[PDB]
Amino acid sequence: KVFGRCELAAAMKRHGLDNYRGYSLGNWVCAAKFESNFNTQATNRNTDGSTDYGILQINSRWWCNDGRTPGSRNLCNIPCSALLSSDITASVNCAKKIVSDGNGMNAWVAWRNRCKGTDVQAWIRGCRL
Ligand SMILES: [Cl-]
Ligand code: NA
Structure with a gap:
C-alpha cells in the first residue's frame, strides 16, 4: 500500500508515535517519506548484505529475521516480511x-539527512487536529 500523507499521520498518531521519546509527528511522517516514499512494501539492499523493510526501512541485521543476513539478532522477534504489511503495527512497534x-531518530540515516533541522510540521500541515 501506499499511503497518503494524513492518511499515515493518524495511524501513526493512533499507534502512539507523537512525542514518542519527544519526537513530534512531523518527524515520523517525514522519516516515512524519505525512507520509503510512503510504501509498506518497500525493500532496498544494503551494502553489508542487509536489507531494509517497509515504511520505515527497518533493518535485517539488527532488528528482523530475513534468513539471509548471516548474524541477525531479530531484536523485534519478527519475520522481516511481516513489516511489508498494509497493518503498520509491527513496524511501529519495532520502530518504538x-x-x-x-x-534516537539518527537510527534512520533519511531522517538525519533530510528531516533533522528542517520544520517537520509541514508534514502534518492540512491533517485532520
Ligand atoms: Cl533523542
Ligand atoms: Na536479522
Whole structure:
C-alpha cells in the first residue's frame, strides 16, 4: 500500500508515535517519506548484505529475521516480511525499540539527512487536529 500523507499521520498518531521519546509527528511522517516514499512494501539492499523493510526501512541485521543476513539478532522477534504489511503495527512497534536504542531518530540515516533541522510540521500541515 501506499499511503497518503494524513492518511499515515493518524495511524501513526493512533499507534502512539507523537512525542514518542519527544519526537513530534512531523518527524515520523517525514522519516516515512524519505525512507520509503510512503510504501509498506518497500525493500532496498544494503551494502553489508542487509536489507531494509517497509515504511520505515527497518533493518535485517539488527532488528528482523530475513534468513539471509548471516548474524541477525531479530531484536523485534519478527519475520522481516511481516513489516511489508498494509497493518503498520509491527513496524511501529519495532520502530518504538529502535528509537528508544541510544541514538534516537539518527537510527534512520533519511531522517538525519533530510528531516533533522528542517520544520517537520509541514508534514502534518492540512491533517485532520
Ligand atoms: Cl533523542
Ligand atoms: Na536479522
